[PDB]
Amino acid sequence: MFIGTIILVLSFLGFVFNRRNIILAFICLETMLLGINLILLRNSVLFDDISGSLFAIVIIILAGVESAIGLSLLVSYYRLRGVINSYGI
Amino acid sequence: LPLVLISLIVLTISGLMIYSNDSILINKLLEAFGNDYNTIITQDWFNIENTTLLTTIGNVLLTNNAFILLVLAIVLLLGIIGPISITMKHK
Amino acid sequence: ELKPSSAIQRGPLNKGGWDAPHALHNDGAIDRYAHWRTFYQERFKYTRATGKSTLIFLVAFPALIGYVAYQSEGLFEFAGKRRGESVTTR
Amino acid sequence: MLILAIISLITFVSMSKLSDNRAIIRLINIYLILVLVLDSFLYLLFLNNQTYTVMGELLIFNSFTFYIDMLIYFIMIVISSLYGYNLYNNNLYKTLFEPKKELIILFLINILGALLIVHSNDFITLFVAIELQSYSIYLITAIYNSSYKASKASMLYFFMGGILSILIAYSINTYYSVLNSYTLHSLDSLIINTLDLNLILIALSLGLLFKIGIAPLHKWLISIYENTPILITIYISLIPKISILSYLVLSNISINSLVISILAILTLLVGSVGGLLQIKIKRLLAFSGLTNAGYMMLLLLLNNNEFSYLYYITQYSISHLAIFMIIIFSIYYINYINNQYNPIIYVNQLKGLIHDNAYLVLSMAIVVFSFIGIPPLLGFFGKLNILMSILNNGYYFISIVLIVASLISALYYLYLLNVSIQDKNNILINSNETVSSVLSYILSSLIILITFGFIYNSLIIDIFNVYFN
Amino acid sequence: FHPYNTLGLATQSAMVGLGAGVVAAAARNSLATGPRNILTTFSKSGGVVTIFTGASIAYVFTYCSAANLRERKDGWNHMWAGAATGAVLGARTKLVPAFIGWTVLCGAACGLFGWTGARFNADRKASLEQSPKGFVQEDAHQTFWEVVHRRPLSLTVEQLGEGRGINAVPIATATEAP
Amino acid sequence: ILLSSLYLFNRILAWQGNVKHFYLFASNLLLLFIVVLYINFNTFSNSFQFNFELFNSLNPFGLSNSDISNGLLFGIDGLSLTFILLTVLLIPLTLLGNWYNINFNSNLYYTLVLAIGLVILLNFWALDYISFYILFEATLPLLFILIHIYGSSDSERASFYVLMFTLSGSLFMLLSIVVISIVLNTTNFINHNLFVLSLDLQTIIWLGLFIAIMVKTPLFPIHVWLPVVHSESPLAGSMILAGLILKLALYAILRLLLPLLCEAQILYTPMIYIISLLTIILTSLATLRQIDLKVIIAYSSISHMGIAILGVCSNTSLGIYGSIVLGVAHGFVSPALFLIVGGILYDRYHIRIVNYYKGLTTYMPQLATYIIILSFANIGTPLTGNFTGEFLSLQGGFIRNPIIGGISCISVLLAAIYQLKLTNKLTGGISSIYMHRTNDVTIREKFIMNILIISTLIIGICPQIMYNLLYWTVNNYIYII
């Protein structure tokens, strides 16, 4: 499924070849999840099957919690150093 | 750029091929671009209720898969307790 | 601020014993010779001579013995053999 | 019992002061023990290998999963003892080992995620459980946030585990797109013959397996293990490995996989050779974990793997706990404390441990020889069962590589004992403070299991024959 | 045994080695430190493309050539192929002891690989788990994994050969008088 | 009893503080007990006699009285009784040979030595492949610790060699034992000659067993660990390693290999003869250029083991009897030579370099006489068990292959050369300038040496005295149609 697949692949490449900042890594994670959900929802429509949409809903909730925890981790990392380097990890 | 190009081609092609069921690899890739046809949308009259996607999701999430909802409640609990644990300094 | 517990009392490690008089008068030259001979494997290198010895004893000699031992297997029987009888079986 | 403990603990800890931490942990410790001894009898349900689907076919309970759950409970009991009980009562040890307010809750939630992974019968259950365990493990890695290394490790964990979680999700959704199903139960011999699922199922296997750090994606997890506080490292290098490996063993989705064969070989080679030049204790133990992961990876290539996997994972868990406990016990005898999160860093700091505590070094010797595989220690019988399994199924080259890796990793296992039995110049005469009775008893029980467990081998096989056949 | 087509199979190997070396060069270029441009990837490759290509040619060509010449398929062909591959890889040392060491030791490791079946996973049908095992029935031929209580003496004479104690007739029976 | 005897041990330790008198007493009782067993051993029967099973599921901590055998089996026939007698003769002497020279942490040292002895003794009782393998490996960590803590200057490298080489061979033996286990679903030695595997599978299983044999014997070309390990070991380690542990390999050939893989063994015998002839000749010649006394003595054992191998693989009754007799005689004489070089000379002078030693006869005539006697015993002078073993082994080897055994007859000369070259310099010439005069041999040292010499002389004059335990054995393993 084209749009989801392209979004996932390009987001993965952006994550991997990121040499600019850490926020790009966070964004690439979020958008890879978006691409996966798009592929899933198209298949859910083509099968007329609720299982795909149920999994997509769960994916959305988990992406929210993962975002919250990832940004908490980033803030805890910031607390000791006061800055994020372009290699900040 | 070299690695980006090789990875682009390989990952895109493989992500289109994982969907096929043909034994031959070239046919696997070819099926990806194989929707030259329109789907025929037809009517029937067996659904008398006004049930939409949201209603059906609620129906399966709260009855068939209630366990998944409760585990998700635990995950949200984690999304509260964890941030507080590492962003707040007690005492 | 991170230090081992003050409660610990460490003394020296003495294995004890009676120091005997030194019955051997060590020769440094002999000791150096013995050290060179004992740890020769640490300095070995593959040259023409050492390689030739390697080829004679680890390759050639085993091959000669093996040819002999597989050619002569079952060939001889000697017990009570008489005149005119063959001592070979093949 | 676990869910109840998590709810009660959140409430109780919320109403408790930071000085109550250890007390609270002690409470939960005894609670877990009680659950293990009063609820054990439920094993009877699985007589003759009866399998139960539960929760509208979301969960699967059998004798294999029941055993894994008991093992995880036992591990949690041992590890929580290390936070609830002080090794010594002096100021330095208060500084070295103090439990955080929320750590016990994070441990219990992570254990829940692991147990749900083990029992997962549907892919939505698997993904929710995997994310529960992953998020918990990130927070556990981060909760000691005064440490620079721990915070950096938590960030690295978050990002690599997120990429691998994405790979797992994509695998599951490709499986759904091919079969309109979310359960492996829909796979039959006819379906496997008819369709090519190999790429999908191996993608799922690799997504799971890179999360416990097999080669060639081993360095990031080894870095995280090195850079966490030691009492965190004991937990985070064991529980995920057990949960993921147990799920893959029970799922049997990679039988006779060429890709898994090659990665298992690479993992054995990398784990054995890459441990050789290590000078830090935790890096050495991490490479040991990598090699033992390769051993267990071999069992994903064959059916009827349950006995050899259960034996190996049990004895390995026991040995891992024992070696970390021994390293913790040796902290009292070292000259130089490197920092408050990792009081001991270098193998050379154990030099002459025999002159300070001889029986600690005897315990170390037993554990090291078990890792090497000397009979009649448990490690020998684990390796023997694995060899029986793989040679029954024709994996000859891999059996030779297994032998070679065992011999190679013996060198870095013997490094610990070697430095530990050398001489040191200033040795201990007396000390007024004794190490804790509770933790010493736990360590001794582990040592005794490693030493004398073989006595029960035939009895164990007899029971296994009636609960797993 | 019908022959391998050494030329075509070896050309295929050439292509695959070149591709794999190109990929390794790209990865090497991305993972390194210091300034790096798009043309330096082969400049700072370390000759990795040549490693891949030369190993591919040596192994596949030698394996096919030895198999065709002996008209057999077994581990010995892989021993020869590994010997040639080790020769290629040890040429990079530029030292005769190291060249010899690579030759013999890679040849031995690949002979060990070929002897086990020349595979990393298993041949499932031939394995003990998928094979007739245990004690054979009445007078059946013994197969690889099967066990008997007595083998036929004719089989022993054929396999071991006559001599040094192996005889077609037991001694006491043959030396009985009438 | 066990409770009471443990109390006895505990109180002795509390009051004396040195465990060694108790260990000497326990080992002497063990020897007496084995002699009592020999008294009640039936010789007109080729069946295992004093059987017991351990760790059965019905009685994990007791003896098995069950109708299903799933524990570890133990029992003895005449062959195993021979080696058990050798073991219980040797153990107290290995305790007594270190009576005075171990001073720091001596309780641990004696515990390690006695444990190694007991493990070997149990190894000779094992009646199945797994019990045999377990007791086979269990000595390695004990030896590692003993050599590492109580060895000479190079003892770290030595401990690592003694662990790693033996583990290396043992793991290929383990492959073979696993294959036997899964193919036959049985592992015991009582009926394993009743199972006839296909010739191909036999040929494969043989390789693993023989790699382990090659490292443990040792044979050329994987022998180079033994001189190092012998040279750096403390005296009890050397005595056990040369007198007992090397005999486990010969026993393994008889017990584990020949009854099960008979046809493959026939097929492989010429390769064995190649390896053994290489061992004999090359190690004998390599001994001529050694400068360490203990290394020279260690190299001697390898050549004698080669002769024993040639005997035991000869497919003749004389060859197998000669191999066993040679094993026993070597177990008498080699520990005596190690006692001389690493117990008497080394405790007086703390050095092993040959250049330092010359003309010991002047101040120590008794030690010189012992050296001469043990040297001529070691090179197979008749009326010594060494001569009987070597002569019968060479007879069997010559029958098995006339050319190979005929060439093997040069070992008489080669052994004479290296041994008498050492003793000539040790006894003759003027007293060395580098060493001061010390005491001649003590009463304890003379006692040990006298025991060993009398044993080798008794079996040298009348080797037939072993036959009542071995006459079934010399027929149990030959394969003739």
Ligand SMILES: CCCCCCCCCCC(CCCCCCCCCC)(CO[C@H]1O[C@@H](CO)[C@H](O[C@@H]2O[C@@H](CO)[C@H](O)[C@@H](O)[C@@H]2O)[C@@H](O)[C@@H]1O)CO[C@H]1O[C@@H](CO)[C@H](O[C@@H]2O[C@@H](CO)[C@H](O)[C@@H](O)[C@@H]2O)[C@@H](O)[C@H]1O
């Ligand atoms: C201590 C040193 C360890 C190293 C030595 C191990 C070497 C293992 C080799 C031996 C062995 C495994 C035996 C395992 C036993 C336990 C394993 C031992 C421990 C393992 C650590 C592998 O045999 C392999 O040999 C290779 C050649 O070298 C072949 O290479 C390849 O060749 C080409 C492909 O066609 C390709 O071109 C290429 O892919 C390679 O070139 C392989 O295909 C072949 O499978 C033999 O097993 C097999 O034997 C055969 C007939 O014997 C059995 O079937 C028989 O059928 C009738 C006749 O057929 C008989 O009438 C019948 O009676 C019997 O039923 C089988 O059932 C099976 O059992």
Ligand SMILES: CCCCC/C=C/C/C=C\CCCCCCCC(=O)O[C@H](COC(=O)CCCCCCCCCCCCCCC)COP(=O)([O-])OCC[N+](C)(C)C
């Ligand atoms: C009074 C309540 C106490 C119970 C608390 C148990 C806690 C488990 C904690 C840690 C795990 C340690 C190993 C568990 C033992 C396996 C039992 C079993 O036989 O395992 C079998 C399955 O064998 C296997 O797959 C292989 C297991 C591999 C074991 C490897 C270690 C062997 C050495 C252990 C020596 C035994 C020490 C005894 C000391 C006298 C499952 O047996 P089962 O599922 O029918 O349950 C048993 C009935 N039960 C619930 C009442 C207990």
Ligand SMILES: CCCCCCCCCCCCCCCCCC(=O)OC[C@H](COP(=O)(O)OCCN)OC(=O)CCCCCCCCCCCCCCCCC
């Ligand atoms: C850690 C290494 C691996 C450990 C695995 C193995 C551990 C074994 C532990 C040692 C215990 C074995 C020795 C005790 C068992 C023998 C007890 C016995 O009674 O033997 C039974 C046998 C028949 O007796 P029964 O059928 O009852 O009839 C009697 C009629 N009057 O009666 C007999 O025929 C007598 C049998 C004599 C056997 C001689 C045993 C010599 C050695 C004894 C102590 C060895 C201690 C070794 C310690 C180091 C660990 C190996």
